[PDB]
Design a protein around this ligand. Structure first.
Ligand code: HEC
Length: 80
């Protein structure tokens, strides 16, 4: 499978598929739209660095910045 989706399915989904803490669900256009509108760069920085209940790197210590980038892009791609 594509890398961003594979990464997503291995733990990010625990919070995101359920919307825990207000995490934006995959495919939830309305949730994602204002997050996308600030630019992909901001979205990627928040994925790497963490934002509120979103842990740095999703709490997956093995991932590269490029892998985190590809998982954030996957979520953006399916939620527009
Ligand atoms: C729960 C413990 C989480 C895990 C595990 C992951 N995410 Fe998450 N994410 C979470 C929350 C609560 C939020 C919203 C934060 C807020 O206060 O607004 C998010 C948000 C994201 C975003 C959007 C960031 C933005 O610029 O608005 C992305 C792209 C995102 N999360 C990606 C992501 C990925 C790729 C993860 C696994 C590697 C992952 N999250 C795990 C909560 C949780």
């Amino acid at each position: 499978m594509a890398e961003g989706k594979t990464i997503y399915e291995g733990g990010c989904n625990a919070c995101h598929d359920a919307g825990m803490m207000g995490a934006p669900k995959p495919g939830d256009k309305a949730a994602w739209a204002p997050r996308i509108a600030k630019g992909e760069e901001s979205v990627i920085k928040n994925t790497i660095n963490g934002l509120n209940g979103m842990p740095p790197k999703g709490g997956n210590a093995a991932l590269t910045d490029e892998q985190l980038t590809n998982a954030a892009k996957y979520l953006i791609s399916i939620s527009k």
